[PDB]
Amino acid sequence: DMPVERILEAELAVEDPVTNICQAADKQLFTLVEWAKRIPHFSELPLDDQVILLRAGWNELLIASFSHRSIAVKDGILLATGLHVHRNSAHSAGVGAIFDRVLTELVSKMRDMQMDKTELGCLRAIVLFNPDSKGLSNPAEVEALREKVYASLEAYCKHKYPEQPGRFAKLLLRLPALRSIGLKCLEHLFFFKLIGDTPIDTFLMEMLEAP
């Protein structure tokens, strides 16, 4: 069974501007491990596959987190360190393109549909249970876990919001934008690591190391 209550409890239990952004990403990587342990059946998987899933989705998992957190603000994002990075601050630092993509494709769309924390956790659970991750000892088991998550999500949507029959599909159609924004974010992190002008902490550095 995959109850949406535990998924929501997992979210509620864990909840130069580029330098401030990288420090917040490192802090949330420690928090991401605690979040994944509270997702049902994740800890029961082999320990090697838990590494594979977290190393493959940490980028999209953390991006979905602060994008939904940034619903409160209108022209910026809310870092987990309590700091706010404004539109113009990211633009003045030369990273306004990906910042605008986060605001228009993710934050504003999350604000438009009033995506609740249960729907956010179910989407992050779907990202976590990625059966296409290379090296999985049993990708069909991870695929079965993903199916139980969006089954509980569709039931939650048709029960909590029965007046919106297309809300379930509208939630899943943000994952392609989450995937593309995540890949562009990895390019930025690799570029700053290659040049070495931005300090990158240990956990964030470990996630950028090659498999």
Partner: peptide
């Protein structure tokens, strides 16, 4: 992947 391994076992 030393940091991720140590946090998952605890």
């Amino acid at each position: 992947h030393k940091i991720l391994h140590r946090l998952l076992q605890d």
